[PDB]
Amino acid sequence: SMEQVAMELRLTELTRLLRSVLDQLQDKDPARIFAQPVSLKEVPDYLDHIKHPMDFATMRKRLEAQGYKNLHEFEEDFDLIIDNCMKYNARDTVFYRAAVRLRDQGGVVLRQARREVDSIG
Numbered sequence: 363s364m365e366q367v368a369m370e371l372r373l374t375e376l377t378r379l380l381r382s383v384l385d386q387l388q389d390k391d392p393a394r395i396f397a398q399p400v401s402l403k404e405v406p407d408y409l410d411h412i413k414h415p416m417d418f419a420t421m422r423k424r425l426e427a428q429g430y431k432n433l434h435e436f437e438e439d440f441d442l443i444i445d446n447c448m449k450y451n452a453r454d455t456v457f458y459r460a461a462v463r464l465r466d467q468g469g470v471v472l473r474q475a476r477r478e479v480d481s482i483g
Contacts, residue, residue: 372483373428373431374428375482376430376431376432376433376479377425377426377428377430379475379478379479379482380425380430380433380436380475381425383436383471383472383475384418384421384422384425384436386471387418387440387464387468387471387472388418390463390464390467390468390471391418391460391464393456393460395447395456395457395460395461396417396418396443396447396460396461396464397417397418397419398417398418398419399415399417399419399420400412400415400417400446400450408450411449411450412446412449412450414442414446415442415446416439416442416443416446417443418443420439421436421439421440421443424439432479433475433476433479437472440468440472443461443464444461444464444465447460447461448461448462
């Protein structure tokens, strides 16, 4: 149908905007601490601690399959990255501190993304 196509174009455009959002958030992680999944070869107990692992490469795969229906879904995944880290790692670690800085810096980007998503519909 024509409606299915229009819906698909909206999803494609959301995907375009989320790709730009994802790029901007990942720039706030210049150490690349959150770029890839935590290695289960190197942290073999990780899944005993963290039930829903997340990372920027895994988000990017979902994004490119147009797997985010709305900004809320994308934000859920970004929040997992931060929140997982802040649980597994102690306050005095470069990992925890990196997550805090990512959260604080990403807040700004996500604030305007929400306005853009609502504005353009």
